[PDB]
């Protein structure tokens, strides 16, 4: 039986009243107002609660007093003790020397005096204890001089705290705080070969309605200090967000391994914001900044990885309506590598779109952009670019096909400055003023055919979807414009139908091409799509060129059917799913990129995934910085096999693991092995992680990091009985994603 059903066998059930005064006693004496007394065994009820005793001894001047075996219970608590009192007007209650249990959730203990206060929002305990462990089990408890719990803000709060494991105290704090309810950090301890002993002791502060902080001392014994972690979460008229501010005043490991630096401080600032106001104003922040390049190699955190080459810093504000939008943004990047200081930023970028449908048979749109490009270096080019893109299209369609004809004008003005260092080092010069005006013409045509697939199974149907597109863009030389924004895009099957070879506006290639493809789909008798496959190709009638033609290739051929791509998905069952994708390029004489996965999931804790990723050595030459072709760690491409798996054992263990292997190196990329054992009041996790984490230039081989880790968390502080699989599966570099 599941861990929830095992723990809920110790949690007391409410079912005695029905949920939405009556009195019984062995004897009763005195008139009803003021000093009525009930002597010998008595039970008394009102709606959701009952009180029971050997004596009840009322007064009014409204107060209840009770003596001998005083026992009270309701839909949230049980209280027991030798003596008790309540005020029936203010709802205040006392029980002396008593024991308590929560109802419908874990939680029990003792106090010298147990109190209900503040319209019974608060419970307060003098000389109190708390544990989440079930009756007869005492594997941990927290003991205080005073304990408070708030039922609305779901927090327990404790003064002169001792933490006991079994009967023995292992910690003291003058003040401490615990989560107790549904409403993401929880008090936690770790040992690891990376940092030795660690703890994480979170404190939650409500600042105002729907904004709350989680100030969290994180200790690391290999290091000199507590790291202070500072998640702040909020809601606002502008939307919702999270801030984080990690800080170490100094760091002995950084002081030992990077000495002669100005200071030893380590910090990260992350700010995420997203939302919409009045449905028309859009606000986004996607900002990360760190003290030094090595922060994510040193510190396990949510907000980046050792896998990353830069920290991204976006701000944007936009207005959006049904027929128009305008957005002002800043894009900045902290690049971690010292190998090249150059990094361009948009400061600012303004994007504008206007839409007007039904202008005769035509739909029309205009895109405008203005951007200023700045560099981290004093000696790189800087530019203002203004772009204008008036667009008209004529969508014709029927039941079985469509044809869409589109015309654009691509109009761009550059004013470029700071050119002297580039023009004194390069044979083809940048120009101060450049105007680039290009017509674009596109025709996109699609059809759909259907067939009865009764060869496979009763009532299934096959769909065939051929697509052909013609695209034209005349040549302009652009070697006088520096490339600030234009990466070479990747040709997936849907990418075979782009009007763009590059992702920005600094390079627009000539186009004179037909792209042709076919998708086929199989539908079952429920009309659910069970399978698809897509295959397509680009045929070029003229060399697709910008004047900056600086790419190697392996063949000199620049015309004909050069690019091929395909994709497939099979929904074998609700539990089994298979994916695959391929790209081939006759300019490389090779498969350019490919990926595959097969996955089995029964449930959130039972799964197996096998996956493969490939990129050709020739694709690395064509699309990445020239030195990637020479460096041993880059030049070999990618040929990676991965396996990821999770399975439960005995309703309380989950075993999780991952293994990724480079088939060209014959060496591992990542391996991970998590084992979590879960009980009602604690869970223990072992986590092993071995990863590629650098390169040794003096010997030409990979550097590995090994983390062997052990972790303990408290449980039954919330309704959580899950075995930890989806967290373990995303602990590593190359984290799990669901491919069904």
């Amino acid at each position: 039986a599941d861990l929830a059903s095992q723990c809920m066998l110790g949690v007391p059930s409410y079912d005695r009243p029905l949920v939405q005064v009556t009195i019984n006693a062995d004897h009763a004496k005195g008139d009803y107002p003021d000093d009525a007394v009930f002597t010998g065994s008595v039970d008394i009820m009102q709606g959701n609660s009952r009180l029971q005793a050997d004596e009840v001894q009322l007064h009014q001047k409204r107060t209840v007093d009770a003596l001998g075996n005083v026992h009270y219970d309701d839909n949230q608590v049980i209280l027991k003790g030798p003596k008790g009192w309540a005020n029936l007007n203010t709802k205040d209650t006392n029980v002396w020397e008593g024991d308590y249990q929560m109802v419908g959730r874990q939680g029990r203990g003792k106090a010298d005096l147990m109190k209900q206060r503040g319209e019974n929002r608060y419970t307060i305990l003098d000389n109190g204890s708390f544990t989440s462990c079930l009756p007869g089990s005492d594997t941990w408890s927290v003991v205080g001089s005073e304990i408070i719990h708030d039922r609305e803000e779901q927090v327990a709060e404790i003064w002169n705290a001792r933490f006991k494991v079994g009967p023995v105290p292992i910690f003291y704090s003058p003040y401490l705080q615990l989560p107790v309810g549904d409403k993401f950090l929880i008090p936690n301890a770790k040992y690891t070969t990376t940092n030795y002993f660690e703890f994480y002791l979170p404190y939650y502060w409500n600042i105002a309605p729907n904004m709350d902080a989680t100030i969290t001392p994180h200790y690391m014994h290999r290091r000199g200090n507590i790291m202070w972690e500072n998640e702040f979460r909020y809601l606002s008229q502008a939307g919702a967000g999270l801030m984080e501010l990690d800080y170490l005043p100094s760091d002995k490991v950084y002081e030992d391994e990077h000495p002669n630096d100005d200071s030893s401080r380590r910090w990260l600032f992350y700010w995420n914001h997203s939302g919409v106001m009045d449905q028309v104003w859009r606000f986004n922040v996607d900002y990360t900044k760190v003290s030094d390049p090595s922060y994510f190699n040193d510190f396990d955190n949510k907000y980046g990885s050792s896998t990353d080459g830069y920290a991204t810093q976006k701000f944007s504000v936009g207005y959006a309506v049904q027929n128009f939008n305008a957005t002002v943004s800043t894009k900045q990047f902290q690049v971690f590598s010292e190998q090249n200081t150059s990094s361009y930023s948009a400061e600012p970028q303004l994007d504008v779109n206007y839409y007007q449908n039904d202008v005769g048979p035509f739909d029309t749109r205009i895109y405008g952009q203005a951007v200023h490009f700045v560099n981290t270096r004093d000696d790189m080019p800087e530019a203002t670019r203004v772009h204008l893109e008036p667009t008209i299209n004529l969508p014709l369609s029927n039941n079985w096909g469509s044809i869409n004809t589109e015309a654009k004008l691509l109009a761009t003005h550059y004013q470029q400055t700071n050119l002297d260092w580039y023009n004194s080092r390069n044979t083809t010069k940048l120009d101060e003023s450049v105007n680039r005006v290009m017509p674009q013409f596109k025709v996109d045509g699609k059809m759909v055919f259907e067939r009865d697939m009764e060869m496979l199974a009763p009532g299934y149907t096959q769909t065939l979807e051929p697509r052909a597109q013609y695209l034209y863009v005349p040549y302009r030389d652009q070697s006088d414009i520096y490339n600030y924004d234009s990466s070479l895009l990747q040709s997936d099957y849907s990418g075979l139908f782009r009007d763009r070879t590059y992702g920005g506006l600094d390079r627009i290639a000539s186009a004179n091409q037909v792209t042709t493809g076919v998708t086929s789909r199989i539908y079952d008798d429920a009309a659910v799509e069970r399978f698809n496959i897509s295959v397509g190709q680009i045929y070029y009638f003229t060399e697709s060129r910008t004047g900056d033609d600086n790419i190697t290739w392996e063949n000199d051929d620049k015309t004909g059917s050069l690019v091929w791509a395909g994709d497939t998905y099979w929904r074998i069952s609700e539990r089994w799913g298979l994916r695959g994708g391929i790209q081939y390029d006759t300019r490389l004489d090779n498969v350019a990129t490919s990926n595959s996965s097969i996955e089995y999931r029964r449930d959130e804790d039972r799964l197996v995934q096998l996956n493969y990723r490939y990129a050709s050595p020739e694709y690395i030459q064509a699309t990445l910085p020239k030195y990637y072709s020479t460096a041993e760690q880059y030049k070999n491409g990618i040929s990676q096999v991965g396996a990821v798996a999770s399975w439960p054992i005995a309703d309380r263990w989950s075993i999780v693991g991952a293994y990724y292997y480079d088939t060209n190196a014959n060496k591992q990329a990542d391996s991970m092995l998590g084992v979590q054992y879960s009980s009602c009041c604690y869970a223990i996790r072992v986590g092993y992680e071995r990863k590629l984490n650098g390169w040794d230039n003096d010997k030409q081989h990979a550097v590995y990091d090994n983390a062997i880790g052990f972790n303990i968390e408290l449980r039954g502080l919330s309704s959580n009985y899950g075995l930890g699989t989806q967290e373990m599966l995303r602990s590593n570099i190359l984290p799990y994603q669901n491919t069904l």
Partner: protein, 154 residues
């Protein structure tokens, strides 16, 4: 051969007039879905209307996640994989509410040089992902009419 040109429209005839409902009617998914509906000849009515016999598509949560899918032999990111998950629901007058969803997968190689160019490429990929999510939701509408009809046979 066996093949024939599709006679029945991609959006079922019971949904040739429908209501589009969203928490963000001006944003990217709502624009992608609204264009996909109009190319299929659907008439769209406002969230409040005098009609009571018109079905509605209610657009729910979008989650976009990019993770490193691949690493070079030094452990730096080779490829990101981007997954977009879109949840939506279709409400039929006097009848049960049908959940539908889209799952779109894309990938790109990183470049720490040209980081600004890779962000423009990521923004362009996300714009394409909303178009594939809008297609995937519209390709699920026939299954809702099949389930609707079979609910009467049950």
């Amino acid at each position: 051969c066996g093949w024939h040109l599709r006679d029945t429209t991609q959006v079922p005839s019971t949904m040739k007039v429908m209501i589009l409902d969203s928490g963000d009617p001006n944003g990217p998914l709502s624009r992608a879905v609204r264009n996909q509906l109009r190319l299929n000849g659907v008439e769209l009515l406002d969230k409040e209307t005098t009609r009571k016999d018109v079905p509605s598509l209610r657009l729910g949560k979008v989650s976009i996640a990019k993770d490193t899918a691949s690493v070079f032999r030094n452990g730096q990111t080779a490829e990101y994989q981007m997954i977009m998950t879109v949840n939506a629901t279709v409400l039929i007058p006097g009848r049960d509410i049908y959940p539908i969803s889209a799952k779109v997968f894309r990938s790109f190689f990183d470049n720490p040089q040209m980081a600004l160019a890779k962000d423009n490429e990521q923004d362009m990929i996300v714009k394409e992902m909303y178009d594939r999510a809008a297609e995937q939701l519209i390709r699920k509408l026939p299954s809702i009419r099949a389930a609707d009809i079979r609910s009467d046979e049950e």
